[PDB]
Amino acid sequence: IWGASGKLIDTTA
């Protein structure tokens, strides 16, 4: 599981 925070893509892998 990964939190949604960035710009164009949600998943922070």
From Swiss-Prot:
<feature type="disulfide bond">
    <location>
        <begin position="4"/>
        <end position="10"/>
    </location>
</feature>
<comment type="function">
    <text>Acts as a class I viral fusion protein. Under the current model, the protein has at least 3 conformational states: pre-fusion native state, pre-hairpin intermediate state, and post-fusion hairpin state. During fusion of viral and target intracellular membranes, the coiled coil regions (heptad repeats) assume a trimer-of-hairpins structure, positioning the fusion peptide in close proximity to the C-terminal region of the ectodomain. The formation of this structure appears to drive apposition and subsequent fusion of viral and target cell membranes.</text>
</comment>
<protein>
    <recommendedName>
        <fullName>Transmembrane protein gp41</fullName>
    </recommendedName>
</protein>
<comment type="subunit">
    <text>The mature envelope protein (Env) consists of a homotrimer of non-covalently associated gp120-gp41 heterodimers. The resulting complex protrudes from the virus surface as a spike. There seems to be as few as 10 spikes on the average virion.</text>
</comment>
